[PDB]
Design a binder for this molecule. Structure first.
Ligand SMILES: [Mg+2]
Length: 340
């Protein structure tokens, strides 16, 4: 029975990612990494604003690599650990549901070479042991997500669920993550731990090869920016949403129900969203079809928000953090009022 995890997740309206922030990789071994991709330093007020709008869950992506000491201890720089804790505490201060992950480790040490399994598992465990210790006394609203889109960057199947060998490696890494956290005890004994597929991919072969831990306090995370050609800008992309492509969402969701939901495994969509293409009305309709599909089985999602809206880049921005005002209240309304 995994009902405790379902109970905790049911308290979430919809979630929000503090993107391009603690996950940013500039600045070297410095707290300045946080602002290295152009976002302002996070404040209590920024977090309050997210909560107040109706996003009562926040995902805090963090890239640790540059703040780590040498193997085998991989000691997290004290200044960085303290700053990560400060940001998590903004959310705890507001009684929010929280996901803390490791993030762009994939730029550094987290390269899914099956021949390097031991070193990979050991580094992931060494990092999570330290995080679990730091947050050992935190309550059940704080969840850990072991990895983010773990893959081999540049590989042929980087974004299609990788290879069978890589997927076995992911299973091993998910276990190492769970094992390291549970070993620290305290509230970490039953904290919700969120494992993932290769690249957070949700294609059938990827789901089919996913090992499900016997640990009853886990959830499986996926990233479904579906359809890719609506949500991203690429040759072949479109900004119009009239429902004709809803099938792309339905098909994929059916594989998620087949392999996870209908088996009683908790699923969380820890990233999704649609880049702004001067198509407010279309995104509002897509949200209805996409989030409405997840709502059928009470699956929760967290929206990616990188604070990019007017400028160049992937325009996932929703909250203008400097002004504490939302870039687009119609899109934001559709998200937070999804259950209405
Ligand atoms: Mg306890």
């Amino acid at each position: 029975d995994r009902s405790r995890v379902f109970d905790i997740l049911s308290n979430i309206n919809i979630g929000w990612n503090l993107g391009n922030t603690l996950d940013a990789t500039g600045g070297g071994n410095s707290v300045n990494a946080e602002t290295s991709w152009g976002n302002p330093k996070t404040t209590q007020e920024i977090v309050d604003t997210v909560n107040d709008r109706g996003f009562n869950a926040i995902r805090i992506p963090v890239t640790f690599a540059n703040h780590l000491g040498p193997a085998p201890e991989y000691t997290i720089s004290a200044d960085w650990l303290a700053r990560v804790k400060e940001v998590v505490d903004y959310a705890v201060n507001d009684g929010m549901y929280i996901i803390l992950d490791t993030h762009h480790e994939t730029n550094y040490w987290l390269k899914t070479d099956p021949n390097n399994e031991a070193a990979l598992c050991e580094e992931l465990a060494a990092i999570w042991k330290q995080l679990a210790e730091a947050f050992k006394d935190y309550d059940e609203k704080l969840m850990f997500e072991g990895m983010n889109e773990p893959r081999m960057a540049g590989s042929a199947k980087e974004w299609s669920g990788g290879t069978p060998a890589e997927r076995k490696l992911i299973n091993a890494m998910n276990k190492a993550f769970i094992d390291a956290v549970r070993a620290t005890g305290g509230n970490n004994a039953d904290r919700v731990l969120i494992i993932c597929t290769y690249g957070h991919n949700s294609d059938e072969p990827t789901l089919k090869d996913l090992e499900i831990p016997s640990d009853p306090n886990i959830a499986v995370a996926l990233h479904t920016y579906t359809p890719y050609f609506f949500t991203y800008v690429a040759d072949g992309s479109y900004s119009v949403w009239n429902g004709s492509k809803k099938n792309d969402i339905t098909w994929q969701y059916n594989n998620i129900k087949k392999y996870l939901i209908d088996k009683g495994i908790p699923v969380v969509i820890t990233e999704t969203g649609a880049q702004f293409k001067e198509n407010t009305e279309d995104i509002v309709r897509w949200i209805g079809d996409y989030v409405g599909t997840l709502d059928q089985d009470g699956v929760k999602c967290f929206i990616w928000d990188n604070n990019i809206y007017h400028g160049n880049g992937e325009k996932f921005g929703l909250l203008n953090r400097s002004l504490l005002k939302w870039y687009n209240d119609d899109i934001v309304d559709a998200y937070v009022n999804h259950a209405a």
